[PDB]
Structure formats: C-alpha cells, structure tokens
C-alpha cells in the first residue's frame, strides 16, 4: 500500500520533471514509444502471488471504448489488446473495432490456437498487427526429426500476413539446450516475412552469448521471395529501471520489461508497472481523463 500524499508527491514529480525538460505528456509517450495495453480477457487460476479471475463484466466494449478515447487524449497512438487468451472472447473484433475508431496502431498478442476462428473477423475489424506467444512444445509436434515447425494452425495467418493485410510477430521462447533448432527455425519464419522476438528460459549460466549471435546471423542470412522484406529477428537488450520510483521499489530487481506501456487489465485495473502493484488505479465511472492520465504520468517514471 502508498499513501495518496506519496502518490500525489511522486505524481508532482513527474510532472515536474516534464516542465524541466519542457515537455508535454504526449511528447513524453511518443519519446518512450509508450503504448496502451489492454487486457480484454482474464484467466483463472493460473504461481509465485495470487490466482487470476475470469473477465470483469465492465470489461466491455462500451468502456473499453471510454478507455481507449481517454489514453488517446493522453497522448497514446498505439492500442494492444492482451490478457490470458483475448481470441477466447466471440467479441474480440468488436474491441478492434472500437479501437480502430481512435487509433490507425491496434494490436493482438495472442496465443494463436484461436486464429483460424477468428482471422476473418479480426482483419474485417481492421486489426494491424498479430504477436503470437509460442511455445516449444508445439513447435517440436509441428515439426519431425527433432526439429522445429510451424504448427498448422498459424499457416493461413502467416500468408495473410505475408500478403500485407497485417503485421504478425513471433515471440520465441528459446531454452539453453534448443539453440541449435531455434537458429534454424529463424529461416522459415524470416523467409515468410514473420519477424521474430527471441528472449531466453530458464546453476550454469545461460548461453545469452550465442543467442545474440545467431540473431545478427539470422538477420544476415535472412531471404524472402516476390522481392519482399523478410521477417527481422531481434532480441532485447537488458536496462535497469531509473525513474524517481524505481531507486526504492522493492522489486526493481524483477523490473525486466523493456516494452514498457500503460496497462489496464481485465478487471478495470489501471497498472503503469508490471513488476509491482504499488501504483496500481482503480477504472473509474467519473473523470476517466484525469485518471487515465495520472496512470500515464507514472507510465512514463522508469527512464528519464
Ligand atoms: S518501473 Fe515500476 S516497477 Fe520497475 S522499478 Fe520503477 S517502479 Fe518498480
């Protein structure tokens, strides 16, 4: 717990930091690349904190709608819808529609068994980009022989996208031991125009080295036919958190995002960190604006 007097302190600071720098908040979001980050779905009792709860009933179109308005008026341009799996609601491209209304960026990050039913509906909705979340397991049971492939389902996505109707990404779990087939999979998915976001997992100290180097080779080596652009392979770099928060936040050493963005989960919680839950606010009926902006201000406190 903080006291409102530390928030509105910290709040103050922020503020105040900006006019030093004579900044605006919207200049602050597009300086950071700062983008909303909506949870339209939440799971259930899925380790290291609490349990998770199904989806808010105001978690709907209609505020998803006042929320997105609102970040707009902050300043943001990009939306992302998220959460446990947002592809498990029907309604999904209702909330791609309500988005498109606001801003041209509107995102999925999605587990993907979900896309062939919803492909058609998401692109009719004007969907701009797909982030698929992989898992090794499927990877190997697409694939034979030991090595990785693209598993069935995401096939028809990869060519819409290829075809231009919408950015899609890969993010790529890549364990110590699979090095090797990770570095060979980069081909198929750069050949078909699918950039890709390797990250590592999981005594002995993970070989990050050999990681950096297959990206640059892959990205070297990249391909693609019909005189396209192939897919980009990248992998983020580590930073440690600096904002006027981050000196005396007791989880600054779990502090790893590097993709920072205001988040509001699906139950109406307006977050500004993922690693801790001290600057968390309420979704309100009333003055969306001021709170919606608030957040923001605290979104940005992790690098100046
Ligand atoms: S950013 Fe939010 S979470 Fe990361 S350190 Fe600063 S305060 Fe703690």
Redesign the pocket.
């Known amino acids: 717990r903080i006291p409102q007097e530390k928030r509105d302190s910290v709040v103050s600071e922020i503020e105040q930091k900006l006019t030093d720098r004579h900044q605006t908040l919207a200049d602050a979001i597009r300086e950071r690349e700062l983008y909303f980050r909506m949870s339209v779905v939440g799971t259930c009792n899925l380790f290291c904190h609490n349990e998770g709860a199904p989806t808010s009933g105001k978690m709907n179109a209609e505020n998803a709608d006042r929320a997105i308005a609102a970040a707009v008026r902050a300043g943001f341009t990009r939306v992302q819808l998220t959460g446990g799996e947002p592809l498990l609601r029907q309604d999904i491209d209702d909330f791609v529609r309500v988005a498109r209304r606001h801003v041209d960026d509107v995102g999925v990050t999605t587990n993907g068994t979900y896309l062939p039913k919803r492909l058609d509906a998401l692109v009719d909705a004007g969907l701009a980009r797909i982030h698929v979340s992989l898992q090794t397991e499927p990877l190997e049971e697409a694939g034979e022989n030991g090595a990785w492939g693209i598993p069935d389902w995401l096939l028809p996505t990869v060519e819409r996208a290829r075809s231009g109707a919408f950015s899609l990404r890969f993010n790529l779990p890549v364990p110590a031991d699979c090095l090797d087939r990770a570095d060979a999979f980069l081909d198929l998915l750069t050949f078909n125009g699918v950039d890709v976001k390797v990250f590592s997992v999981l005594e002995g100290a993970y070989p990050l080295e050999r990681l950096e180097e297959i990206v640059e080779q892959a990205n070297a080596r990249a391909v693609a036919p019909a005189g396209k652009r192939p897919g980009e392979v990248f992998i983020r770099g580590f930073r440690?958190?600096?904002?006027?928060?981050?000196?005396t936040?007791?989880?600054?050493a779990?502090?790893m995002?590097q993709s920072?963005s205001l988040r509001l989960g699906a139950d109406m919680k307006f977050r500004?960190?993922?690693?801790?839950r001290?600057?968390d606010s309420w979704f309100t009926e009333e003055d969306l604006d001021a709170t919606v902006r608030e957040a923001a201000l605290?979104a940005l406190?992790?690098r100046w």
């Open positions: 440690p958190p600096s904002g006027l928060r981050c000196g936040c007791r989880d600054a779990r502090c995002e920072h500004p960190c993922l690693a801790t001290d600057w605290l406190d992790y």
